[PDB]
Ligand binder design. Structure first.
Ligand SMILES: CCCCCCCCCCCCCCCCCC(=O)OC[C@H](COP(=O)([O-])OCC(O)COP(=O)([O-])OC[C@@H](COC(=O)CCCCCCCCCCCCCCCCC)OC(=O)CCCCCCCCCCCCCCCCC)OC(=O)CCCCCCCCCCCCCCCCC
Ligand SMILES: CCCCCCCCCCCCCCCCC[C@@H](O)O[C@H](CO[C@H](O)CCCCCCCCCCCCCCC)COP(=O)(O)OCC[N+](C)(C)C
Ligand SMILES: CCCCCCCC/C=C/CCCCCCCC(=O)OC[C@H](COP(=O)(O)OCCN)OC(=O)CCCCCCC/C=C/CCCCCCCC
Ligand SMILES: CCCCCCCC/C=C\CCCCCCCC(=O)OC[C@H](COP(=O)(O)OCCN)OC(=O)CCCCCCC/C=C\CCCCCCCC
Ligand SMILES: CCCCCCCCCCCC(=O)SCCNC(=O)CCNC(=O)[C@H](O)C(C)(C)COP(=O)(O)O
Lengths: 124, 128, 88, 220, 104, 67, 62, 459, 111, 175, 178
């Protein structure tokens, strides 16, 4: 989707732009925002040679999964807990991204409506 | 009644859709008779040497020799300088050369001018 | 291996078989030397249908110019034998 | 690359659904699968494309072998309009071809599933051209369409071949080759998928309707 | 040469020619390994229209889809160490502008 | 193994080919059923897709149209 | 006569190839290059015996 | 280097004193021995050339050409003896004398240290070739062909002589070493422009250049098989060797004087490749193939880069071998059926399978299949031209598409299809023809095994 | 010496033996197709081993064994890459070719 | 091995991890490795021992040819042909040596790209810098000479570059 | 392929050929047998509805309209028998067909095997040599002075003659030579 229909048919001025995002500063609506912490050091990630696209905030679970995959080689059906944990925390990262998108959308629509209302008040 | 089919150069008209073969005259029948007569005479001539036990070699075909000679050696004696011939020769023999010369000269002038200013990204360009 | 080396008697048997299932042809009155137009009283369209049945049965096409000339089952048998190099 | 893959797969899948020569149908299916591979490359998923190559080789070669067996049995006849009821006359060939067609259509837990399903779900969840996505979905429906055409015309109904029945598929070489590729087309997807290290970020969070898109379009 | 009757007993069956008959000036172009002019079920200038319309329509719709892309309602992907500044090309003696990602 | 033509009759079938075909169809269906029984999440999805509309404004942090 | 095929078609070519690679190809630098093996937290290096420490006290989102 | 020159001058009286039935054997065995002797010239240095004496020197560009010539003479002898069986002993000895004189003149041509002696020998090569073409040609057109071969060359070479002597009055020497060490720039003037043209047009007409190539189809079709072999394999490379030797003094004028010749070479490459598609004659197809390849060589020499020079040398060697093999292959069928029309005898694979294999290998090598040296030279030239200008990859690419087409077309026209029904005089191939084809093809792959030896001095 | 390289090279090497034997007294008998089928099957089962090594330790290699020629600054060598793609695709192609050859023996019997 | 100097061709200290089994199942890779060792590596080792034992019985040497330095083209008069010949040969030899240096650096870069795996973009940038420097120097020295190159043309190129640099520096000084 | 063509095609022949083509294309459209039988009987009724048209002009106009309708409604991909000029096995075996005269070029060692076959071949060659002159004489005597008008050849009539121009028809290589 409905977001595509809303942006491409409805009013796109209150619809977030995925390329140009975010347009608001990170501590605008929040009194304080906690800094996201990373568990795996740069050297561990380099030594594991994960990839340039797998070196996100989720790399520790991936390193664990790779280690247990290498350890239990012939039994290729044993690394289910580690895979599940990695997939779960990936899902959490995705949910956080959806949260950021929805926050940006409501920020844009609220700010634009409030600017229009303030201009209307100043016009009368 | 039904949509019509119009022939083209690379998609000709079928025999069953040719109007000329459904309106006939005894003159056309005579012409077909002569055509079959010539074809049968040529076939008999071919088959007489084809079945000869004492024939060893290649049955020379005057038609093939005529085709090759017309395609290769008979062209210049029948060539006349006309406006069409001269214009087509000048076009197809001069236009491509000057067009390609202009293209390559323009590209190389652009390349050289970029080189002089020092902005070409010529790093690692060792082999040339 | 592949299909067996078809013989003359097999060809004649198949021809008479496919002809005996034609509703316009009497089985008893049909012989290997019966003429389609004269002996059996069929028209040209029936001959065309018979030739098409032969093409369907033996799995190869008979050119029209060659097809028109066939008039008796023996002619069809001879044509099929000559086409497939059947000599025994 | 993505646009070229999309147009290729759409056009070849659309052409395949009306063909009567079985070899032509399988060739157009191969071309559509290559277009899908190009689409997968276009969305920045090369390892998925390689896995799809490996997955597709098995059942494509095996489907071609089944078609060749059918052709050889019916005196070198390739038109499906003269291919009658071979469901009972060619049991092993029928079983193999049905399994291969199911694997091609992305039937769950077969060889084609573990690559094509992930390819579709990765295309649905990326910043790509919308027309390419629509063309990919139409192509993956037309895949099932032409597989259904092949099965329906080749194995169901009444005989349409010449009356001299030479059907015989009892040869150890043909049976062994088709059986080997059949076991491959049943288990290689799972075995290979579970035995390679993760080279891709998985798409774990997906809407229920969009996660099932390939199955729905295949069933339609 | 494809237009000629294939059921005739030609002297050269492959070329579909007879001995002694005149040879076309462009025989090597029409050897039926090459340019074919045999009639088609659908008229020329009608196949051209449908084909050109199809290609032009696909090109236009691909461009339209490019200008109206499809995506998911998600924010940008986040990478820890300043969008992996050291990983994507090094340059360890410049102190890039910090890139900070906050919890939500 | 020798099989002769039938000429408008059903072709001769040996027991081995029927056994092989039935066995392989049965094993394919058994594999599909067993894998779906053990790995259903690969088909039906594993993690629930949340609805952005139900997200409270406090956790997303936008001011109540005042400042 | 029984397993002669595996001797003149597998064993001899692999003997020749191993000889050529071990004693001629490897005699020059950078002729055979293998990518460095992966190292994870917790392994022990074979040569120096170094043990790689553990990894930062997982938050344990059980 | 007289150790190679004297054995040919000894081949002469050896042939003239042999018994009436032992001329071919003696000529073949001793030509092969001389080729084995000349194989030693390939031991080249990396800095300077082998300066044997005040008169002869050997570089790494002329050594492969000498080896090719000494190898080609026995092949010409093997090919010639089939159709000269009815000839008298004296005329056979005269034919062998013509071949020996041609080889001797080429050998002294490729190693002359001074430009005027090189010109003298490069012009003396005209007489034996013209005599062979006019005297032992098969059809009435041979006469005219000879004339087209002669004057087309001479009109290009007469100005060069003048230029040469002019240089001697200006710089004081024509020795190549002194000329190279004492090179001075050529200013942009009309006199320098015409000096450039005089020095270049001879080798341009020898290559030949597009527009100046009308003599080549005539000469290569009307000549006997040995004549065709010697024109295609070696005689076309004289222009390239001369251009490489002479372009040392033409800089920096060439930097802008090469434009018309580059355009002619590229567009005529495309044009001749297109011509080869519609050809009713089998020898003219090979002739126009030679024209296209030498146009590529002209481009490589004109752009004047080391990669282009290496590619040009490799392409000349590979083209010589390939064209000689193609001519011999066509001549076998001609000797069988007494006609050069391509569509006369078809389906020859059914009747002559090993000859079909020879045809396939020759055609695959013609269209530059990797990793043959043909493609090595072609790819080096293409890369150098891409460095020269990026748009060239269009024209070159077009050629690389057209060439293969006609090549395979020829094969499909001659070997595939169904045989002609009325031709029943197609005898099984002799051991002589098979040995000729094998001796043509094996050195090609052997050179592919070690390609650094035909890549010229720029290697 | 880490049999990965030797086995990977041997897998490609043993495929050319029937090509070299095509001029012997086996290309003239009726046992040649079986000979080629057996060669392909042996090549497949031999190539199965580097796949196992990669699936265990992720081992990859490049082998530049023969130096063909060198330009001024460009070196051309006979080099092979045995990364994931090669070790994963070679056994699959060998398996498919083995089955195809077996099928061919029966399909092309009358040729 | 010691066949080549390890300073011209350096390598990292080659850290490898010890095996850590976690399953009761046997590992087929080690079993196949043992079989391969016992069936291939030992006969090949014995044959190589025989070959080396035969070689050590007949030992002889070959030497690297040493060239002294002759006056360059700058010490050469306009028409002194002999000194020109010597200087030109020396220049050609130096050109070949420079090409070989660039080749060595390129081999180093390729070795890095293969060895470092997925971290090649960061882990081996030092050799990228080395290749950039050596390629820039080689391009400044020898590029654009074309065919028929010589010591005189290289000297003219160097003089032109020196004049341009001196003019630019003198202009920048006045700024 | 065996019968000599005539100067032109008669109206009956054209109608019969159209009937065959229409029936075959209708079979291509109607895949199933019962549907094909139903529509083929309908087509037969359509064809024999106007069988008794005494005016040839209207018959030819009906034929024209039938050809136009057939061309509009023809199957774009009609069924072709495998060995027909449009089939997938049309000229498959032409690479295996070798003329008999090649056996004249065999080495005597090759001819040592199959001695009886080559004895029979010598018998056939001698028969051809002995009958060629009589064949030529019969063709000369039977031909009209203005040359042949068709491609039909006469049969043998005398005691022991052979039909003229028989060597290259009797000694066809085979349909499945190798
Ligand atoms: C990749 C191959 C590897 C093989 C390893 C060992 C092979 C060594 C071969 C060396 C050359 C052999 C001589 C060729 C002429 C044959 C003479 C002949 O008449 O034989 C009849 C003889 C008797 O047969 P018959 O029963 O009378 O048959 C009846 C008819 O004659 C009917 O006969 P037919 O129909 O069988 O015809 C013969 C057959 C074969 O004959 C040919 O046409 C091929 C001839 C050579 C190729 C010519 C075109 C290629 C141009 C580039 C050449 C590069 C050469 C490399 C260096 C070679 C140095 C000598 O035709 C073909 O099969 C088509 C050939 C298509 C080639 C496909 C590959 C293209 C090149 C790929 C790259 C090659 C290098 C790969 C490695 C690169 C680095 C990784 O049959 C044979 O002897 C067997 C032929 C086998 C051909 C092998 C072709 C592949 C090898 C190419 C060169 C290998 C180089 C070796 C050094 C290391 C590399
Ligand atoms: C079929 C193929 C045969 C072989 C073809 C070979 C091609 C030969 C052509 C020669 C190429 C260049 C010749 C002349 C060099 C410059 C070209 C000139 O036309 O351009 C301008 C020249 O301006 C005018 O065009 C003057 C020339 C006009 C008279 C020439 C007639 C041109 C008509 C074409 C006739 C075809 C000639 C070939 C006949 C076969 C350049 O301006 P400018 O800087 O001032 O002159 C530079 C020389 N300077 C430095 C001494 C001053
Ligand atoms: C860049 C330079 C080249 C670019 C291509 C430009 C067009 C080239 C035209 C080539 C002309 C060659 C003429 C002689 C070739 C041989 C004769 C010949 O081809 O005969 C046609 C022969 C017979 O036809 P059949 O369908 O097989 O019928 C058989 C049943 N009766 O069929 C063919 O071979 C057709 C070949 C011609 C196709 C050329 C047109 C291709 C154009 C491609 C443009 C699209 C580019 C793709 C871009 C993708 C985006 C990255
Ligand atoms: C057959 C049975 C033989 C059994 C005994 C032999 C066992 C091993 C003996 C080893 C012999 C010594 C040896 O090989 O040393 C390597 C020795 C010298 O090393 P180079 O790198 O060439 O030196 C640089 C100068 N070019 O090389 C050799 O002589 C052997 C090379 C064989 C390589 C394998 C085949 C390669 C050729 C295939 C054709 C390809 C042609 C073009 C390919 C282009 C690719 C870019
Ligand atoms: C699938 C799409 C294509 C199918 C569409 C086909 C449409 C065609 C249907 C209409 C065709 C006609 O009515 S056209 C009807 C043609 N009418 C005549 O010819 C009148 C004179 N009669 C004769 O010549 C003979 O009796 C003859 C009838 C030849 C029988 O020959 P025989 O008795 O000696 O066998």
């Amino acid at each position: 989707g409905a977001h595509l229909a809303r942006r491409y048919l409805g009013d796109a001025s209150k619809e977030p732009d995925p390329l140009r995002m975010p347009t608001f500063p990170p501590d605008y609506g929040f009194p304080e925002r906690k800094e996201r912490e990373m568990v795996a050091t740069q050297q561990e990630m380099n030594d594991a040679q994960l990839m340039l696209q797998q070196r996100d905030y989720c790399a520790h679970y991936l390193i664990q999964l790779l280690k247990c995959k290498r350890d239990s080689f012939p039994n290729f059906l044993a690394c289910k807990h580690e895979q599940h944990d990695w997939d779960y925390c990936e899902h959490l990262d995705y949910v956080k991204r959806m949260k950021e998108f929805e926050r940006e959308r409501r920020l844009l629509q609220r700010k634009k409506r409030r600017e229009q209302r303030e201009a209307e008040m100043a016009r009368g | 009644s039904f949509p019509k089919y119009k022939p083209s150069r690379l998609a000709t008209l079928p025999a069953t859709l040719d109007p000329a073969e459904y309106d006939i005259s005894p003159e056309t029948r005579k012409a077909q008779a002569e055509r079959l007569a010539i074809r049968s005479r040529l076939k008999r001539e071919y088959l007489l040497q084809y079945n000869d036990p004492n024939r060893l070699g290649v049955i020379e075909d005057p038609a093939l020799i005529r085709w090759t000679y017309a395609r290769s050696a008979n062209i210049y004696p029948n060539f006349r300088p006309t406006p069409k011939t001269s214009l087509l020769g000048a076009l197809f023999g001069i236009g491509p050369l000057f067009f390609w010369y202009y293209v390559f000269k323009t590209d190389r002038d652009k390349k050289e001018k970029l080189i002089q200013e020092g902005k070409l990204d010529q790093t690692f360009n060792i082999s040339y | 291996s592949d299909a067996p080396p078809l013989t003359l008697e097999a060809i004649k048997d198949r021809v008479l078989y496919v002809l005996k299932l034609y509703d316009k042809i009497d089985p008893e009155k049909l012989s290997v030397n019966s003429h389609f137009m004269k002996d059996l009283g069929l028209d040209s369209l029936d001959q065309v249908e018979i030739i098409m049945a032969m093409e369907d049965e033996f799995g190869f096409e008979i050119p029209d110019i060659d097809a028109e000339k066939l008039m008796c089952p023996q002619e069809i048998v001879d044509y099929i034998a000559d086409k497939k190099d059947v000599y025994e | 690359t993505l646009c070229l893959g999309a147009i290729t797969t759409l056009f070849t899948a659309l052409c395949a659904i009306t063909q009567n020569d079985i070899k032509k149908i399988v060739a157009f299916s191969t071309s559509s699968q290559l277009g899908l591979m190009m689409v997968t490359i276009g969305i920045n998923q090369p390892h998925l494309a390689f896995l799809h190559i490996c997955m597709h080789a098995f059942f494509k070669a095996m489907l071609f072998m089944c078609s060749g067996s059918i052709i050889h049995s019916l005196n070198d006849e390739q038109d499906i309009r003269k291919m009658g009821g071979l469901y009972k006359a060619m049991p092993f060939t029928t079983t193999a071809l049905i399994i291969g067609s199911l694997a091609l259509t992305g039937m769950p837990y077969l060889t084609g599933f573990y690559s094509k399903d992930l390819i579709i779900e990765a295309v649905n969840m990326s910043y790509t051209n919308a027309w390419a996505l629509l063309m990919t979905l139409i192509a993956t429906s037309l895949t099932a369409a032409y597989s259904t055409r092949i099965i329906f015309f080749a194995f169901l109904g009444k005989p349409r071949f010449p009356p001299l029945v030479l059907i015989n598929e009892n040869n150890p070489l043909l049976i062994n080759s088709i059986k080997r590729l059949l076991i491959g087309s049943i288990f290689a997807g799972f075995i290979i998928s579970n035995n390679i290290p993760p080279m891709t970020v998985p798409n774990t969070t997906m809407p229920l309707y969009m996660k099932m898109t390939a199955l729905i379009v295949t069933i339609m | 040469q494809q237009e000629r009757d294939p059921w005739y007993d030609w002297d050269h069956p492959d070329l579909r020619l007879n001995w002694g008959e005149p040879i076309h000036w462009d025989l090597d172009m029409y050897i039926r390994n090459r340019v074919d002019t045999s009639p088609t079920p659908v008229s020329w200038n009608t196949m051209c229209k449908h084909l050109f319309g199809f290609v032009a329509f696909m090109l236009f719709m691909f461009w339209v889809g490019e200008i109206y892309p499809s995506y998911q309602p998600v924010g940008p992907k986040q990478y820890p160490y300043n969008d992996l500044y050291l990983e994507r090309g090094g340059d360890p003696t410049k102190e890039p502008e910090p890139v900070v990602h906050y919890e939500i | 193994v020798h099989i002769e033509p039938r000429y408008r009759q059903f072709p001769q079938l040996t027991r081995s080919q029927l056994i092989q075909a039935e066995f392989f169809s049965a094993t394919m269906w058994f594999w599909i059923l067993w894998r779906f029984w053990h790995d259903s999440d690969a088909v039906l999805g594993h993690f629930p897709y949340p609805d952005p509309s139900q997200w409270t404004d406090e956790e997303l942090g936008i001011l109540p149209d005042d400042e | 006569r029984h397993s002669i095929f595996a001797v003149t078609h597998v064993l001899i070519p692999v003997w020749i190839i191993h000889y050529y690679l071990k004693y001629h190809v490897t005699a020059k630098p950078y002729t055979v290059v293998e990518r460095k093996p992966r190292i994870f937290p917790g392994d022990t290096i074979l040569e120096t015996g170094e043990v790689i420490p553990l990894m930062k006290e997982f938050p344990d989102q059980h | 280097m007289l150790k190679i020159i004297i054995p040919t001058t000894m081949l002469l009286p050896m042939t003239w004193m042999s018994k009436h039935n032992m001329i071919w054997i003696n000529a073949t065995v001793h030509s092969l021995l001389i080729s084995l002797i000349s194989l030693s010239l390939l031991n080249q240095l990396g800095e300077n050339s082998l300066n044997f004496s005040l008169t002869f020197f050997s570089d790494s560009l002329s050594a492969p050409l000498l080896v090719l010539t000494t190898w080609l003479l026995p092949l010409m002898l093997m090919a010639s003896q089939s159709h000269l069986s009815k000839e008298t002993t004296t005329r056979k000895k005269l034919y062998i004398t013509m071949l020996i004189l041609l080889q001797l003149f080429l050998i002294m041509t490729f190693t002359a240290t001074e430009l005027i002696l090189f010109y003298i020998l490069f012009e003396a090569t005209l007489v034996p070739t013209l005599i062979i073409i006019t005297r032992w040609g098969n059809q009435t057109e041979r006469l005219n062909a000879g004339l087209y071969f002669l004057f087309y060359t001479l009109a290009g070479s007469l100005p060069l002589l003048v230029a040469l002597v002019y240089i001697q009055n200006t710089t004081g020497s024509l020795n190549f070493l002194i000329i190279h060490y004492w090179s001075h720039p050529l200013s942009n003037s009309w006199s320098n422009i015409f000096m450039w043209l005089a020095c270049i047009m001879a080798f341009m007409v020898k290559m030949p250049l597009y527009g100046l190539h009308l003599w080549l189809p005539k000469a290569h079709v009307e000549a006997p098989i040995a004549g065709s072999m010697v024109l295609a394999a070696v005689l076309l490379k004289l222009g390239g060797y001369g251009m490489m030797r002479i372009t040392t003094i033409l800089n920096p004028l060439t930097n802008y004087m090469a434009y018309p010749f580059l355009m002619l070479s590229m567009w005529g490459m495309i044009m001749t490749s297109s011509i080869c598609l519609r050809q009713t004659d089998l020898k003219s197809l090979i002739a126009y193939s030679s024209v296209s390849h030498m146009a590529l060589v002209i481009v490589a020499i004109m752009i004047q880069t080391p990669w282009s020079f290496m590619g040009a040398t490799a392409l000349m060697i590979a083209h010589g071998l390939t064209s000689s093999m193609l001519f011999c292959l066509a001549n076998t069928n001609y000797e069988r059926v007494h006609s050069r029309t391509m569509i006369l005898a078809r389906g020859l694979q059914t009747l002559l399978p090993l000859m079909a294999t020879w045809w396939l290998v020759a055609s695959l090598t013609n269209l530059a299949l990797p990793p043959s040296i043909n493609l090595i030279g072609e790819l080096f030239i293409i890369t150098a031209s891409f460095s020269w200008s990026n748009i060239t990859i269009i024209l070159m690419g077009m050629n690389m598409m057209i060439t293969a087409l006609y090549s395979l077309y020829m094969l499909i026209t001659t070997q595939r299809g169904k045989y002609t029904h009325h031709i029943n005089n197609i005898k099984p191939s002799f051991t002589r023809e098979n040995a000729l084809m094998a001796l043509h093809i094996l050195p090609l792959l052997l050179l592919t095994l070690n390609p650094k030896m035909i890549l010229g001095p720029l290697y | 010496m880490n049999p990965f390289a030797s086995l990977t090279l041997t897998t490609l090497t043993i495929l050319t033996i029937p090509i070299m034997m095509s001029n012997s007294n086996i290309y003239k008998t009726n046992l040649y197709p079986n000979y080629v089928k057996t060669t392909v099957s042996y090549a497949f089962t031999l190539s199965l081993v580097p796949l196992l090594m990669f699936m265990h330790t992720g081992q990859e290699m490049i082998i530049s064994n023969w130096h063909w020629m060198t330009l001024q600054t460009v070196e051309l060598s006979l080099s092979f890459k045995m990364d994931y793609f090669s070790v994963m695709f070679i056994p699959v192609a060998l398996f498919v070719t083995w089955s195809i050859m077996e099928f061919s023996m029966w399909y092309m019997h009358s040729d | 091995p010691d066949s080549w100097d390890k300073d011209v061709y350096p390598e990292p200290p080659r850290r490898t991890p010890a095996p850590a089994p976690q399953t009761s199942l046997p590992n087929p890779v080690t079993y196949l490795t043992k079989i391969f060792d016992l069936l291939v590596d030992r006969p090949v080792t014995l044959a190589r021992e025989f070959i080396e034992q035969q070689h050590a019985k007949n030992r002889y040497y070959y030497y690297h040819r040493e060239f002294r330095r002759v006056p360059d083209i700058t010490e050469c008069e306009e028409k002194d042909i002999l000194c020109m010949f010597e200087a030109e040969m020396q220049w050609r030899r130096d050109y070949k040596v420079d090409q070989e240096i660039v080749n060595i650096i390129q081999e180093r870069l390729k070795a890095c790209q293969q060895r470092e795996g997925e971290s090649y973009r960061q882990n081996c940038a030092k050799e990228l810098e080395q290749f950039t420097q050596v390629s820039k120097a080689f391009q400044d020295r020898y590029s654009d000479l074309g065919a028929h190159y010589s010591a005189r043309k290289c000297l003219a190129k160097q003089k032109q570059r020196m004049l341009a640099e001196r003019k630019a520096a003198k202009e920048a000084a006045a700024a | 392929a065996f019968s000599a063509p005539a100067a032109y095609l008669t109206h009956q022949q054209k109608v019969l050929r159209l009937y065959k083509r229409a029936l075959r294309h209708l079979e291509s459209w109607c895949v199933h047998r019962d549907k094909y039988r139903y529509f083929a009987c309908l087509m037969r009724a359509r064809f024999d509805e106007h069988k008794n048209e005494k005016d040839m002009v209207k018959a030819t106009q009906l034929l024209r309209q039938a050809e136009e309708e057939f061309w509009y409604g023809q199957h774009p991909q009609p069924y072709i028998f495998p060995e027909s000029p449009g089939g997938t096995s049309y000229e498959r075996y032409e690479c295996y067909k070798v003329p008999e005269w090649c056996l004249d070029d065999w080495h005597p060692s090759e001819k040592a095997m199959y001695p009886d076959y080559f004895a029979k071949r010598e018998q056939w060659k001698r028969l051809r040599r002995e009958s060629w002159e009589r064949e030529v004489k019969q063709l000369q005597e039977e031909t009209p002075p203005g040359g042949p008008r068709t491609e039909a050849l006469p049969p043998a009539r005398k005691e022991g003659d052979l039909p003229p121009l028989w060597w290259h028809i009797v000694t066809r290589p085979r349909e499945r030579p190798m």
